[PDB]
């Protein structure tokens, strides 16, 4: 609704539940997508990320062509304050994850 088509920058702070989201994808022609946002966790309270966002970068590490494992390591090692570049692609998310 107030989500643009182009990539956006979101800053999250890591908590006791991590970043408060989980990821799928990173294989074939599917990039890294947010599949779940934990209620009350850091991503949810930020208000800015959505299921079906593709993660393009985290703290400058390019995740456009990462595998799931590569992305999970980048997110684990990104530190307490994490800058995410995300692009909202709900139709492409549904093609892969429906």
Curated annotation (Swiss-Prot):
Family according to the record: Belongs to the MAGUK family.
Disease: Intellectual developmental disorder, autosomal dominant 62: An autosomal dominant form of intellectual disability, a disorder characterized by significantly below average general intellectual functioning associated with impairments in adaptive behavior and manifested during the developmental period. MRD62 is characterized by mild to moderately impaired intellectual development.
Tissue distribution of the protein: Brain.
Domain PDZ: 9-89
Name recorded for this polypeptide: Disks large homolog 4
Domain description: The PDZ domain 3 mediates interaction with ADR1B.
Stretches that traverse the bilayer: none
Cellular compartment(s): Cell membrane; Postsynaptic density; Synapse; Cytoplasm
Originating organism: Homo sapiens
Modification(s) after translation: Palmitoylated. Palmitoylation is required for targeting to postsynaptic density, plasma membrane and synapses. Palmitoylation by ZDHHC2 occurs when the synaptic activity decreases and induces DLG4 synaptic clustering. Palmitoylation by ZDHHC15 regulates trafficking to the postsynaptic density and function in synaptogenesis. Palmitoylation may play a role in glutamate receptor GRIA1 synapse clustering. Depalmitoylated by ABHD17A and ABHD17B and to a lesser extent by ABHD17C, ABHD12, ABHD13, LYPLA1 and LYPLA2.
Subunit structure: Interacts through its PDZ domains with ANO2 and NETO1. Interacts through its first two PDZ domains with GRIN2A, GRIN2B, GRIN2C, GRIN2D. Interacts with ASIC3. Interacts with SEMA4C. Interacts with CXADR. Interacts with KCND2. Interacts with SYNGAP1. Interacts with LRRC4 and LRRC4B. Interacts with ERBB4. Interacts with KCNA1, KCNA2, KCNA3 and KCNA4. Interacts through its first PDZ domain with GRIK2, KCNA4 and CRIPT. Interacts through its second PDZ domain with the PDZ domain of NOS1 or the C-terminus of CAPON.
Protein role: Postsynaptic scaffolding protein that plays a critical role in synaptogenesis and synaptic plasticity by providing a platform for the postsynaptic clustering of crucial synaptic proteins. Interacts with the cytoplasmic tail of NMDA receptor subunits and shaker-type potassium channels. Required for synaptic plasticity associated with NMDA receptor signaling. Overexpression or depletion of DLG4 changes the ratio of excitatory to inhibitory synapses in hippocampal neurons. May reduce the amplitude of ASIC3 acid-evoked currents by retaining the channel intracellularly.
């Amino acid at each position: 609704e107030d989500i643009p088509r182009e990539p956006r920058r979101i800053v999250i702070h890591r908590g006791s539940t991590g970043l408060g989201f989980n990821i799928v994808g990173g294989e074939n022609g599917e990039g890294i997508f947010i599949s779940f946002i934990l209620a009350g966790g850091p991503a949810d309270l930020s208000g800015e990320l959505r299921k079906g966002d593709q993660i393009l970068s985290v703290n400058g590490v390019d995740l456009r062509n990462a595998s799931h494992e590569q992305a999970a390591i980048a997110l684990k090692n990104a530190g307490q304050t994490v800058t995410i570049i995300a692009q909202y692609k709900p139709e492409e998310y549904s093609r892969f994850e429906a």
